[PDB]
Design a protein around this ligand. Sequence first.
Ligand code: HEM
Ligand SMILES: CC1(C)[C@@H]2CC[C@@]1(C)C(=O)C2
Ligand SMILES: [K+]
Length: 405
Amino acid sequence: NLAPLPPHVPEHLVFDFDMYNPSNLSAGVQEAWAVLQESNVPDLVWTRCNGGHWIATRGQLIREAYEDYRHFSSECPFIPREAGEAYDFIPTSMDPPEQRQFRALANQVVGMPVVDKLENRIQELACSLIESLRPQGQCNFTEDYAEPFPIRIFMLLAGLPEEDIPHLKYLTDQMTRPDGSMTFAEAKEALYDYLIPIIEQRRQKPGTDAISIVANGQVNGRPITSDEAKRMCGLLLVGGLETVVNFLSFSMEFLAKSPEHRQELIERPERIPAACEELLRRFSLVADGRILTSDYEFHGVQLKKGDQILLPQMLSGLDERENAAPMHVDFSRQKVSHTTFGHGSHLCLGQHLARREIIVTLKEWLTRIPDFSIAPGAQIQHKSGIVSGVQALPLVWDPATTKAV
Ligand code: HEM
Ligand SMILES: CC1(C)[C@@H]2CC[C@@]1(C)C(=O)C2
Ligand SMILES: [K+]
């Protein structure tokens, strides 16, 4: 269903893209979104789907908007408008000057000194999961690795019981790829409901886990409130449960159809960090946005105050103007240009954690299970949203070709 065209939007900019169900999804998520960059399509379009919002389609405009926070505010960053109004997570729902103080604390708990201390646990979990899959000759990758590997590391780091993973994953799923069973406002309230007793517990006893450090924190030298801590801990949960989980499956789906690319990493394992960077461009998967604070002319188009604008982080690196032949994976690409981890003052805080988990996954999977493919006759289903995902990934291999380490 389409929302009526607002009077102030020129009819010739209308392109009805549905970000939660793009029309070409069967060809792949990123391919479905890349129809926005055909030569007939302008740099700035209006979709009447999902209540009606702008979409910037080129990397040049996506970067400009994310730098200019005084016109493009993160107070309402999700589409549909109801979701963006309920969205109050910290730091992303704040602009500078208020935003920067909370970043320091969030950085403190997923920052690089934390990741170095976790190296053995990351490595031993990756090996423990993979060695337990190897003699089976089959897995459901999303259930059996992509979810438990990054999510158990995050629950360990935050100090939360592993038994709570299915309830929490379902709620964060409803905030990024909704089912229809919950609105965003309801999923958010249920996740706040979960954190409220935990946060009051850990403000009593100072501690080393990520919730304690946030709940006992100061921001620009003043005590963080219980409510501010709730809104920051919830955002950490969403990042920990949704991003790497889904990115891993996209990568592994590609490697399972691309033996040429598999073989390249098997023989030259020191290409792995670079391949990580080029998989992150090709299979970029986040797309959120901003809301206009004032009437503003932007690349010839008159935006009204309160218009929402989708600024898909995913599209910048798929733009041919930023990377030649963008849909080819080329692990020796010379200048890998992308905005997979965002742009501007809201640059991703967990990218050190993310990169370690991806590189450890590629290294430990390929040395033990070098060859695998998609289970015969299965077609991989995808789902699009704020964070796009792979719905299921059946893999198979012959265990006689594996290597026990
Ligand atoms: C492949 C993995 C990941 C991707 C693609 C990714 C992507 C992004 C993007 C695009 C943004 C900017 C959104 C905006 O400007 O509105 C962001 C911000 C953020 N991310 Fe990541 N992320 C990843 C991993 C993680 C992980 C594992 C965490 C763990 C907590 C995390 C925590 C955060 C936080 C807290 C912010 C908000 C920063 C702020 O608003 O100042 N991210 N991420
Ligand atoms: C867009 C994100 C990837 C980033 C971290 C979690 C996420 C869904 C957000 O709401 C901000
Ligand atoms: K809001």
